[PDB]
Write a protein that binds this ligand. Structure first.
Ligand SMILES: Nc1ncnc2c1ncn2[C@@H]1O[C@H](COP(=O)(O)OP(=O)(O)OP(=O)(O)O)[C@@H](O)[C@H]1O
Lengths: 830, 118
């Protein structure tokens, strides 16, 4: 069968039978050639984009035809294939054809046995050759001369030409007729190679075909791309127009009619050289192997490691499949197959080199890092798309600071700020679709087994795209230039720095009635307002005693302006876990790492504005299990996109529902219809936990079967039931195979034991408790207890929130804190 | 309708549409119970591969079916808008249009548009 050997050279001249992919067209084209002679210009065309295998295809037809010339009644002799790009820049195609035709005639005359016949045929052959030579100047002249007139009137020729004068077509027509008699063939096959290397040379081929190869004894088969031929023919019809006419008739009404004529000039020029019934299109691998199932009459296999037989080959869809699936850390489904179908649409030359590079590097490793292996192949084939788009070419600059830069520019050219961070190859241009998988390999390799810096993709790489789309808005390019520089895109030193910076960006937005509850953050008040009712006092920082003191310390993000304002956000919590996990494995280093995130970090308003010893022992316990599980994390590129998509949507749901529940008195209470400054931030970390948990069950590589069930994807807003039920269902499903939880949700498993997020999940006044909601909370705690090994809060610690010691396992002061822009006038209803 | 014929891939498209996809404003502007439910979904999918195989769809009818559908909604949104009266809930009468009377006459729109130009 058709088996591709990636260690065979795979060259047009190195292809043998059972290696040809277009075996059907090689068979089909041959009889159509013979039938056109067995029964005027007779020209066949083989269309296909560059890299489809046109040169490999065109030699096979010549090779097959020469094999059994004698057996068939009609005899066809084939010239050696002519490559117009390799010929001299000024050598006419008529000279090249005659020189190759002369060789076959000369070699056949030396095979003659009768001296009487050899002398007669050779004399007639050189008679025609001497007349082409006498007329070759007509092909190449810068001017005419009256001395040529005596040659045109030179009718004293022994041979007969029907047309008077010095006609090059008649001389070549009789020369071909003579060559057919000498070679004893019914027709001669002139074969042309691709012009895609340099399509300016294709005009000489096209002009020679119509001017000279009009004989009934000539068959012409040409290859190339009809678009490239079209771009070449159209450019010559413009040269037929008077140059001065093109500026004096520059009106759009007349310009739209010159283009109409040239389109008609171009339309029939193609139709008269290459008849549609004589055309043959080279099909791509996606049109050969098809989708799952048969989906195609041609089956193609491939060899992956040397020492193969024919039995142990692999389907090319599978070979591109496993390479994409294992390389990009994907799992079987639409996403892992959408990429494969994108590679099957690429040219075969590009497809083979991606396949060949991968499976020769892979065999080197066995004498692993499959994402390193694939990214080597993908990077090495998409340079032109990578360069044109504006990506990074340096392997030393394979850093996530630049990876955020390209993503912002990738979606800027993609103009898709909603799904552009997905990196799916759905881009309009193939150049952007080629970069999509390359960028996908960057996320699947650089962020491979790195629980720290993958959130920087979620927080800077894909996060900044969402923030730029809504709250921000050539001057637009200059405006983009201001945002990309000020926001520190490409200059990222810490995730919290971006988190600090974005709090000053998402704040600048018009909100209904001007309530300082923005997307994912609450604008805490740095002042004190009179007549503040209830047990809700000013935001006190000293009241936070213990671990909970550092929880909001990172969360607070002061902004320097004419009126300084502070924000507590979930991004700073996301910034903390990224930077804290970006440290060593020693207690001394992690202690030296906390000061970076708990210190008073502060950013500045953008110009485009008109305005804990015991904790560290638990922190290292988290990191004691991080490295045991961090090395097993294989996150797909779209997995960060899928997780962030739910995250960005959850914050809008939370910032909308909770904003209108900041009533006057008794907001903690018992009802869920009233919220406080800590209730909003309670679900923000819960949203992040939910966003990580949901899509990771669906779209992670280390977890094959989904563990949510066929339920509904409702995000927790104002209620913890949504987050509770999914974990409850998870335990039952894992019991069937006795599966663990550390490897089922490694991103979520290690986001549960994080001591930074522990205070923010159970605020004292930010909690929603009720008699019917306690049945949800009694399951909210019965599941997290088992997965970790103990309970984050004891019975007395947990019971205090539901219904007198101040403890650091929960927030203490943010619950009563006021929010800027929230006037406490209307009391809570019931 | 663009799915497999087994019992597994049906849920893949089924559960996909359950989640309300995120959507942001375009920049051009100024600013159990499902185990047997999927069987009925697969029951209709057992038909999509059983009837339309012998259809002969032209390209004129697709626009014709859509054009009838498009114009029909332009009348529903013009007449049901004023019929949001005080007692429009549970619209046993005709002029009492609830959020379902404005909705029910949008799915019969698809059924009607695939019969006039069918
Ligand atoms: N039948 C085939 N079997 C195996 N590999 C093939 C086949 N056809 C094409 N290829 C692969 O695709 C590459 C491109 O093929 P080829 O050079 O013949 O086509 P082309 O790019 O259209 O031609 P040209 O070199 O004239 O521009 C080959 O080098 C080879 O790697």
């Amino acid at each position: 069968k058709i088996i591709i050997n990636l260690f065979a050279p795979n060259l047009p001249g190195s292809t043998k039978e059972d290696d040809l992919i277009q075996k059907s067209l090689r068979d089909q084209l041959v009889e159509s050639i013979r039938n056109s002679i067995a029964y005027g210009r007779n020209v066949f065309f083989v269309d296909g984009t560059r890299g489809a295998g046109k040169t490999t295809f065109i030699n096979s037809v010549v090779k097959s035809l020469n094999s059994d010339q004698d057996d068939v009644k009609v005899n066809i002799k084939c010239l050696p294939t002519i490559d117009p790009t390799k010929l001299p820049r000024h050598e006419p195609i008529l000279v090249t054809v005659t020189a190759r035709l002369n060789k076959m005639v000369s070699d056949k005359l030396k095979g003659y046995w009768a001296s009487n016949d050899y002398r007669k045929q050779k004399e007639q052959w050189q008679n025609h050759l001497a007349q082409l030579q006498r007329g070759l100047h007509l092909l190449t002249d810068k001017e005419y001369k009256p001395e040529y007139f005596s040659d045109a009137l030179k009718l004293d020729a022994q041979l007969d030409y029907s047309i008077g004068g010095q006609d090059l077509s008649e001389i070549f027509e009789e020369l071909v007729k003579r060559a057919c008699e000498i070679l004893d063939c019914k027709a001669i096959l002139i074969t042309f190679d691709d012009i895609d290397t340099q399509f300016d040379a294709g005009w000489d081929v096209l002009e020679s075909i119509r001017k000279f190869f009009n004989s009934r004894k000539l068959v012409v088969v040409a290859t190339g791309d009809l678009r490239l031929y079209s771009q070449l023919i159209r450019g010559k019809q413009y040269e037929n127009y008077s140059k001065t006419l093109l500026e004096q008739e520059k009106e759009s009404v007349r310009l739209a009619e010159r283009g109409y004529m040239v389109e008609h000039l171009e339309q029939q020029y193609l139709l008269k050289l290459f008849p549609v019934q004589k055309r043959i299109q080279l099909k791509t691998m996606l049109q050969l192997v098809g989708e799952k199932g048969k989906a195609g009459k041609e089956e193609i296999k491939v060899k992956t490691e040397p020492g193969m037989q024919d039995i142990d080959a692999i389907d090319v869809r599978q070979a591109i499949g496993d390479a994409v699936r294992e390389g990009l850390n994907l799992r079987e489904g639409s996403d892992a197959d959408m990429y494969v179908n994108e590679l099957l649409k690429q040219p075969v030359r590009l497809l083979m080199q991606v396949l060949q590079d991968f499976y020769t590097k892979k065999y080197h490793a066995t004498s692993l890092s499959v994402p390193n292996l694939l990214r080597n192949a993908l990077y090495g084939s998409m340079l032109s798309s990578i360069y044109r788009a504006g990506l990074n070419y340096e392997q030393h600059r394979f850093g996530m600071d630049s990876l955020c830069k390209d993503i912002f520019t990738y979606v800027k050219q993609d103009r898709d700020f909603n799904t552009g961070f997905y990196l799916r190859p759905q881009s309009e241009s193939e150049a952007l679709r080629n970069c999509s998988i390359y960028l996908a390999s960057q996320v699947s390799e650089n962020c491979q087994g790195s629980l720290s810096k993958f959130l920087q993709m979620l927080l800077v790489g894909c996060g900044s795209v969402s923030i730029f789309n809504q709250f921000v808005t050539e001057k637009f390019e200059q405006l983009i230039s201001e945002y990309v520089a000020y926001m520190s895109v490409g200059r990222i030193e810490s995730a919290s720095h971006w988190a600090n910076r974005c709090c000053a960006v998402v704040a600048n937005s018009p909100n209904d009635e001007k309530i300082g509850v923005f997307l994912g953050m609450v604008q805490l008040n740095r002042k004190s307002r009179q007549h503040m009712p209830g047990g809700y006092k000013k935001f006190n920082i000293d009241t936070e005693n213990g671990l909970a003191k550092a929880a909001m310390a990172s969360s607070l993000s002061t902004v320097a302006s004419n009126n300084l304002m502070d924000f507590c956000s979930v991004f700073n919590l996301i910034g903390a876990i990224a930077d804290i996990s970006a440290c060593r494995c020693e207690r001394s280093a992690i202690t030296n790492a906390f000061n970076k995130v708990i210190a008073q970090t502060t950013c500045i308003v953008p110009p485009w504005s008109e305005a804990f010893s015991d904790a560290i022992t638990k922190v290292e316990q988290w990191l004691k299990n991080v490295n045991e599980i961090e090395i097993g994390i294989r996150p797909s590129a779209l997995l960060i996109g899928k997780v962030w998509s739910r995250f960005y949507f959850n914050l809008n749901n939370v910032a909308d529902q909770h904003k209108t529940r900041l009533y006057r008195n008794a907001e903690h209470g018992r009802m869920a219809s009233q919220s406080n400054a800590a209730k909003i931030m309670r679900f923000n970390v819960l949203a992040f936990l939910h966003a990580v948990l949901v899509e990771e069950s669906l779209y992670h590589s280390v977890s094959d079967r989904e563990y949510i069930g066929e339920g509904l994807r409702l995000n927790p807003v104002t209620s913890v039931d949504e987050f509770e039920k999914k974990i409850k269902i998870i335990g039952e499903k894992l019991k069937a195979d006795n599966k663990t939880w550390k490897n089922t949700h490694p991103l979520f498993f290690l986001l549960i034991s994080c001591p930074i997020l522990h205070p923010f999940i159970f605020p004292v006044g930010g909690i929603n408790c009720s008699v019917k909601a306690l049945n949800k909370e009694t399951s909210f705690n019965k599941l997290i207890d088992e997965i970790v090994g103990d309970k984050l809060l004891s019975d007395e610690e947990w019971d205090y929130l539901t219904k007198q010691q101040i403890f650091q396992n929960t927030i203490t002061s943010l619950n009563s804190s006021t929010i800027v822009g929230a006037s406490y006038d209307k009391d809570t209803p019931a | 309708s663009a799915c497999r014929c087994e019992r597994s891939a049906i849920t893949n498209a089924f559960n996909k549409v359950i989640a309300q996809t995120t959507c942001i404003v375009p920049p051009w502007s100024e600013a159990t119970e499902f185990s047997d439910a999927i069987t009925k979904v697969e029951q209709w999918l057992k038909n999509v591969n059983e009837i339309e195989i012998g259809i002969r769809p032209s390209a004129l009818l697709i626009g014709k079916v859509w054009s009838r559908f498009y114009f029909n909604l332009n009348n529903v949104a013009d007449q049901h808008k004023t019929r949001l009266y005080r007692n429009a809930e549970h619209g046993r009468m005709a002029s009492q249009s609830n959020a379902a009377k404005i909705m029910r006459f949008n799915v019969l729109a698809f059924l009607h548009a695939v019969l006039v130009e069918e």
